[PDB]
Symmetry: C2
Subunit: 79 residues, 2 copies
């Protein structure tokens, strides 16, 4: 009759940085091309240590699914 | 050309507390009973702010399916 213990990780992180994205939507409701501010993505690359373009494609895909991104964990999820 | 903007958020943090749980097994399939540390749970209530029991039933059910928890949005996923 052997036993075993189960471990559980409880995380809790709220609030952080912010990024403003730009999307040109027409009346018809069509989406042309999305371009995330290269400026805000530049400085963020200095505090993170990741190229800008790489960050643009990251934060970009987000605005599409509207969600949060984890760097120190490299994960992506949405509400 | 009505341009739309999205306020994305990038959270970068590393941490997380672990919880110990005792689970007795026999036929390696049936679980007689499952008890959770009422101590580590009472101390965790200070970090959550919500009643202690609420945490027990939360960290308990999770110990059954073995998974993590995020208070950032009160969610539960498998490990």
């Amino acid at each position: 009759v052997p036993s075993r213990f189960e471990d559980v990780r409880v995380v809790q992180v709220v609030a952080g940085w912010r990024v403003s994205v730009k999307i040109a939507e027409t009346e018809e409701g069509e989406v042309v091309t999305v371009k995330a501010e290269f400026d805000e993505c530049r400085e963020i690359g200095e505090e993170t240590g990741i190229p800008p373009r790489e960050v643009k494609a990251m934060v970009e895909a987000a605005a599409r699914v509207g969600g949060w991104v984890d760097l120190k964990e490299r994960e992506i999820k949405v509400q």
